[PDB]
User: Which sequence fits this backbone?
């Protein structure tokens, strides 16, 4: 289960950093 949840943590991280732009 964590396998899927892990993807969300790492993926959700990139999204947050993406917003940082500008």
Assistant:
């Amino acid at each position: 289960f964590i396998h899927h949840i892990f993807r969300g943590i790492v993926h959700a991280g990139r999204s947050i950093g993406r917003f940082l732009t500008g």
About this structure: DSSP finds one helix and no strands in the chain. The radius of gyration is 10 Å.
